[PDB]
Symmetry: D2
Subunit: 314 residues, 4 copies
Amino acid sequence: WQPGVARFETALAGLEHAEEAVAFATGMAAMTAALLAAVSAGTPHIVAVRPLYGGSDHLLETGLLGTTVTWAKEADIASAIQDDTGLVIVETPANPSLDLVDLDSVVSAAGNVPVLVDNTFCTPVLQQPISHGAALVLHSATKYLGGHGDAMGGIIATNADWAMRLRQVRAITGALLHPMGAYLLHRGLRTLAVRMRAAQTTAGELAERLDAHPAISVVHYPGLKGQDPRGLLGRQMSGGGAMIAMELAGGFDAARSFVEHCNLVVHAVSLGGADTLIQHPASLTPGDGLIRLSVGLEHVDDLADDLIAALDAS
Amino acid sequence: WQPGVARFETALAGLEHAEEAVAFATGMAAMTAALLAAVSAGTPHIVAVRPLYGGSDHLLETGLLGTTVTWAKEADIASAIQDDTGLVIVETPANPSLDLVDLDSVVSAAGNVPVLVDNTFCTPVLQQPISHGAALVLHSATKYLGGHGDAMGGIIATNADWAMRLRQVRAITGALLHPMGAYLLHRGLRTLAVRMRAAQTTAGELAERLDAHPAISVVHYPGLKGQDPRGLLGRQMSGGGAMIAMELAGGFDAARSFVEHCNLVVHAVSLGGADTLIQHPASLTPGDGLIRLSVGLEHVDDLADDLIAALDAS
Amino acid sequence: WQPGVARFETALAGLEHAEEAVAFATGMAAMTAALLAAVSAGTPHIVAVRPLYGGSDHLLETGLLGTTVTWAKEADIASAIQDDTGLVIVETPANPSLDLVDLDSVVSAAGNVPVLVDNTFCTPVLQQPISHGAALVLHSATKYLGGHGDAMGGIIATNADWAMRLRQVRAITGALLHPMGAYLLHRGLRTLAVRMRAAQTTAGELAERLDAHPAISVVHYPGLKGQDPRGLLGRQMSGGGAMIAMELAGGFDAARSFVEHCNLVVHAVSLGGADTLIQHPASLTPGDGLIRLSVGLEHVDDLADDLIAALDAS
Amino acid sequence: WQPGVARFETALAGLEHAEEAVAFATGMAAMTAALLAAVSAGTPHIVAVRPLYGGSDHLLETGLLGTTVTWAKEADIASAIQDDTGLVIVETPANPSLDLVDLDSVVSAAGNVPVLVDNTFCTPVLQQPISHGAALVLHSATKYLGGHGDAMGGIIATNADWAMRLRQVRAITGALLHPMGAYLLHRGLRTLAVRMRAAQTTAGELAERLDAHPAISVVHYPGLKGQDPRGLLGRQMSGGGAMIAMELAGGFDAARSFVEHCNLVVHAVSLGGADTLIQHPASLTPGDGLIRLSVGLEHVDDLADDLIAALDAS
């Protein structure tokens, strides 16, 4: 019953072109409510597509909320669907491999089963899952939506029935967004358009410079030459996005050495802000010689000068 | 992983004399986490003592979190305890009737089963359930702890094992307290001692004035003529508390007329803060002619003047 | 033109019984605006009463705003009033010696000259200078008004002409109160009545226990028998207030040793909060063996047990 | 002595390439402190360039702070400088006309007199006055620096001597920035680069479409059709900025009619945010048929379609 939460909810619902949106304390609380809404509806089975986000897959794997998950590849989602399947969870691009998922194909495979798309790294600026047929669109507002991640958040833009169902869970589960945090998110939402466009354009140029260096074997980025065999860019995505994932030829040995030599680019577990970030998945808990990268609002030449110098370690 | 949350957690743990405390977005989120922690531990049965708080009983009644509840009277809790019972939920004084529950007797009846006590209206100022043997002490920080209800909250002061279990649920459930909200709660915690003492002393005088009026049949307030037959005040409670329940002789007809005639005392769903409030549970969704009154910081004389004049108009 | 500032302004104006109030960023900004309003009115002379607050006297002494000050004793204010005198600045009780000033006598001496009273430590709860004839009442909102001092402030409760004059200065001087800071002050204003009453009652008992100890020569608290020869308590003040000053018999040697032995009471430059504070003017920049004390909301017995133990150790 | 203020101060000092910066409550407070620092230094004369910001010229015109102003054109600043001149105030581009001022020429004309440049609309993104020889650079942080104007501000990036002088004034004047407001400004500073670049690029396209319409006589936007005869763009400015001034051929009659027909672009006194704004100096208090523009983060096709349609209706 807060005003700051309502203004942020309708702002994101309009951005995603959804009927309404429901805001929660964190991204985890939004996923929890969506899962609990399916369980309460007498439909606790979830067909989740892998790759999926680190914290989100713990929720399904443990099955704390009384959920049963059957991991299925994108190509065969329909086969995994059971009579009690209530949701089809899918993250695009497939974090942290950055593989593109055809949302139109996923929705047709699900049929009468609602599809939940994690549009966290894409943002409504670079992807509209609702338009492809996704019933629900999940967000972890901390990354990109807020811009700085100082205020945590989680929101699902969906149709009226699923939104009412989510609000009912929120009512007794109590995972509410604080008005101060919602205010910071709605403030950052005004500049989302210019931030994602600038971060995507600097990421595209950065992706070209990374593959040219012999220190890394290849770098994953949808916008790169031949890294979109499906033709999903333009049809589904605005561009290549602001996420770069690269594989080092030196393996785990060169990965940790490359991270410590970076001065401008810093290391963090949560990624997706105004500052450029890197995260070694092997050095946190994925590939051993794999390094993740979230592109910020810095000058492309300043980032390239720092990454190339750190790669020169070998 | 927030600083403002940690400082509020340890402040309340010290007030309740518990090993540590775990803070959640709302009171509902704390109860949800406690219930989910019991379910995850392979013990989903809950022996709850009816009466219970309005929103808390819905969580058990629906059994959204995979819980099985067996409502039992205080006198026979031990009999209702099954092999899979993980918690004994009990609110004292029994909202809304304000019936006193002997915590020492409840803990002995539970035996090896952890006891969760809702100390929301009592606050650590007027009741220490931990000292009586309660394993967990739940709070809805919105009422009394914060002082104004501007910042929502929910916290459980408990031993290290249950606190670690609650933190694990919080980690994937994501029902986190916003640092701004935690700051406002910790700020209000400094003045909790002088607020509850002043509210309790003005409620004790108000309870005497209400029973004297012929408009109401009986007034429920622990610190009154023969209203404490168990000898729980002094032994368990500091005084009579700041809550007063009252049943109007006119039934529902005079009860709603008493609410609409009140100008100073406000009609609200949430009750407990720096102001005096009245709630009619029969008009809201309990008994037909029962009004619940949360004593505030106002002067006893001017507080009696508004209530007595509203009673004069049926 | 902020909403949070307006609600705090009218709340304090009502507390002080003034027509309206003007809020500034800090206490210094309020004094600066009052001084600049007098200078702009073609009346830059100020008759200030000694003693005065540390930072406020620097403003007059330097004469940065184009002011000419004539420091005068309470007894001969009328004689120091020149043709161009626009204000009579006076703080009561005289910080830091705590000497009571008869406001009724000061106003009669000033005559047609407006009187500005620093009611910071007294608060509208324990003193109403407006009722005695003071044209303006200055406050440093951080101390006592806010309760914790987390949000800085400065406000002057005065008549419409002086308030319009102050608003005009604020308009081009730009020393505005931030709405967030004003919100925290207005929130703390709700509990001001119960906090000052509880801090005053605990200070009165603490002063009796302090004089009894042979470690200190003379305790200073206008309230203890004999420390009010003018009969100002009751007539002007509510009680003795929450400020206790004292002089150690051991001089500067015993003064610093007593401060380090305190565990519950902490030392700070700014005072007037929920926690009990102590301040040594000699060890900060007055007398060599003199200590200051801001009584908080702690239990009188808990404060006396720590203070007496610290006094015992020289 | 606040943490949030210090981090914002050093961030802006680095952006402007100044030794240090001093932050105040509002832009007016920063100008007031700069003027008071000159007055206190025994140098109260100010040579200000005509034209100047609306509120800033009132401070000099009234001479509240004990200042004497001699308004002079850019071409003859040196002649207006007297023995007691302590500052040379200059705004570039000269609002409202948007005329470019050669900072290198102004600094040479001032010689030993410190030069204060109001870089509010240019921001460190599009102009570095420090590099041209300006001793002080004033900002009204509300406009552009914050991005939304929700948190007010004022800051001067200057050398160590002038910064120490400003801090000394701030110390007794008390026009402090609230930490919450400073936090919002420092948060918005991270996105300043992408916001000013995007607003400048859409303003450059907008000015081309405005001059083509016969409703307006001549548009004022630095570097549109050889509107920069001095060669100041590139040498001093990054581009044309986000400000466009325009004179209607219909005079005051067409000026008010064009404002009411606008739906997307809104009217306000304070200008410089994420949203596009228009202002009529004649209808507020300059030329009779002149309007200004604060280009925001909207798409150029959305702004042009709205402005051209409003121009069609007189």
